[PDB]
Amino acid sequence: HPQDLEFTRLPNGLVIASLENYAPASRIGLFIKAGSRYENFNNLGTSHLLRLASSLTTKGASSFKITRGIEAVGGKLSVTSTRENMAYTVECLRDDVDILMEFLLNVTTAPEFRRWEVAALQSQLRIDKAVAFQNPQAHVIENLHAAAYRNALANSLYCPDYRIGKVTPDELHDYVQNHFTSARMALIGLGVSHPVLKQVAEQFLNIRGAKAKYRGGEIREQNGDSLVHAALVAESAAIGSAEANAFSVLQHVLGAGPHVKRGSNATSSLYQAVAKGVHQPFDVSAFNASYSDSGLFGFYTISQAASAGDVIKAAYNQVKTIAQGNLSNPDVQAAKNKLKAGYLMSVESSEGFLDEVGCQALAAGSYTPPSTVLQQIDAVADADVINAAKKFVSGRKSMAASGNLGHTPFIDEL
Amino acid sequence: SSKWLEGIRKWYYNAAGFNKLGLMRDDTIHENDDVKEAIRRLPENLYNDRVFRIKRALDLSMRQQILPKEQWTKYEEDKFYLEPYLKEVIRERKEREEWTK
Amino acid sequence: ATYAQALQSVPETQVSQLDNGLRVASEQSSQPTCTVGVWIDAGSRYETEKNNGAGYFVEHLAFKGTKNRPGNALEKEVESMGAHLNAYSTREHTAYYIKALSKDLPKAVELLADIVQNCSLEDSQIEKERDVILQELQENDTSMRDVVFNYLHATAFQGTPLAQSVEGPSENVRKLSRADLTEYLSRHYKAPRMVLAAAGGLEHRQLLDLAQKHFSGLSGTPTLTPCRFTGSEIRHREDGLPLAHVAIAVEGPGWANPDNVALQVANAIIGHYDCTYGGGMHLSSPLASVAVTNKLCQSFQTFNICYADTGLLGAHFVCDHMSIDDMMFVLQGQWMRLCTSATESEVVRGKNLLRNALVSHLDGTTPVCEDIGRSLLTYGRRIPLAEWESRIAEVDARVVREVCSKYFYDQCPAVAGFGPIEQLPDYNRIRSGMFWLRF
8 A cells, every 4th residue: 555645725725635445434524614513592492403314305315315325335324513514425435436425515515404303403403412411421511612602712612592483494505605605615535535615616616703701610410320520621722733642641540432442541640649539439530622713621520429529539639749840750640641642543533544544634733653753742741740830730621510419519618 | 469368367266155154275185185184284373374374264164254345355366375385285295206116 | 547447556464473372463554554453263152161251351350450560550551651451352362453553662662561471460450350240140131232232143053152142141140260260371371372463553573573572582382162043032021111122043154154144245235223323215225125014113224243153134123013024024025135135236336335345344453453453363364355345246146146046045044132022923933934834
């Protein structure tokens, strides 16, 4: 395999990357900057609806023929999204990509929004909101982002309560016609040839406010499920900055994903510090979300009802005493190894490689290979870590608490 | 040939009868699955005007009294709104049959 | 770029054998990662009644102190080099795989050998892991799907030790002696029955050299009877829970048959449905289509699980206690439609679905290395996907309805019900609706 990806910025604004590996899976990932922050009070919960709007009829192919053709060639179509990225992935084997490309372009360029499908999809929004929030943890995440900013970043991934049913297809047509432009689209292809992608994207696209502000404070959801969820997060840094990479080194210092299942994670000092503090089975993990303007660094704890505030104090004083100059340089290098391990071994298959290459191309406007990204990881020093921890201690706090909250510090009891 | 044909068409419309009872094309359709689907897909104000005209027509059939002279929907004031909807529903029935074929 | 050229373009999984009976296999790739694991055939089939859940308890004890490192120094070395560890066990197999990096390899291979041969038994840790398995039973007495499948196996292999769960009895847990554990570890692992497998960015020559460096000198030196499938029905009337969980299966054929591939085409015709799919009134498989039309079910999967030349051809649905009867009716209707009255285009579509499902199944390094281990356990060898494509091309609807006539037509199935299952019919209703009288 000597071949490589190809980059092309077509001048009405779109990004194209092509890759021919001699792997049978052909995947097309179409990424759009149409997240929750690009919706507002007049289209609350609309990105949830459009994420469920995959099975609409198109001017060119009715949704019956769409579904039967896509499952007749056997390819899989999925809609996944984050607060800045809508994402359409279509996968198949390498010969039948043309008709699936035609269906994808028909869905992106020409939605019809016929009203009976919108009503049935309101019922589907109700069902999907139940399936989403029956997990508690994502609900804690969404209330954390609600507590994070005063503006459009606090728009949830899912529709609110009263907003179900009262969203018009005309706002959907308007949101399509002013948020699906040529300069906000990235087209990634794995397993297919470049010029077919370039010619068909040249054929059938032909299309053509500010940043959010810090709010701070707490949100308490008294629910009482015998496990207090507590998220303490400050604002960190924008996307791709050396400051945000320093916070990533800091969260690899604090705590990462469980590398030893049915183990104890004896290296992550938060677990041993809180296990020194509280001799009860807890869980502490670090957290950092990155966005095109800002970023959110903190941690997330699952503890008992009457055993939450001591865990929070143990974690916060551990972060303080790391910030005040108690940290080892082989521990910094071990955080570097954990960051390299996560970034390599999250993009091994075509799915993670697709996600990373597409977000990298849509964000930066070009490609950068992962080897020099690992070199940039290797170009991170220690005063970065100390200043990142000092910034986490110093600034205004944001807190999302949920559960039996009879033993939780509010503001002054930190 | 052409306009005399239209004269025959207007003659049939005036000899049919439902012009004298306030009805259009889209008030005199026999129901199948597809017709009921097209009625289900209707807009709001059209649905309310349709059921109001139907209720007046069934009432005037009930007391067997036909409308006065100048309350009659004459030729070419009717609205053929159902033909796109019901046409596309028959088209989707043919589409299912052609996919199964 | 065509399909046969793509199936031509695949690495080859070079194998070797260490002369203890050890099998080793590798397959390379051009991304900077690897996955190195050990598969040992040790499940609940080889255990006894009073020794149930032994190897599960061993892989609980696998990282709590060895004959070189203590209980925390192993975690220290693994997390200091930054590896990814995982371990599991079926009722048949036992697996220990590390998603590993392209540079920390030989010391980690030595670590994995020390995991194999010198798992020490600290009595503090035998007490702690006994209480941890008590906590795991306490937690996993709620996840309904695994309880369903354990009830399915329990009613499927009644009397025979295959019906035993991997967890087994708590009475065994409260008497776990170290002596039987040492005896189990000394007997059920050593000489022929272990496979090292490595998939990812490494070299096979240096892989066998590290096998020579560490796994050589292991120096090791009477089971697999046919298990009688019973066929019966177990039901748990337990009305406290809102939903309902009903599974039904028959005896699966196994591994040495292309009729298993035909049955996978049949499950590609039916298989899975979840109620959150985009587009419900337009789905190809008629079962889920009419289920969306009538709002009956929530989820199902009709599928296969293959044990060692046997298994369970299964179908489980989660639904409501007002939506069981017509669910089972249309389910058996699709069964007998595949048994007698299948068309051709649905078989072609199912073959393309099986192709795409296998290709997207074997992506990454973990499923590839898992596939290598499971192929060399069931067969002693690996069958690449081009032969699977040829045997897909060996499939028409006539052979499919022959095989479905073999494995469905008036069987004695195993039915497991869980929850408010009052609507669930009696077993003879399943027996009557099983075979068509052509209605």
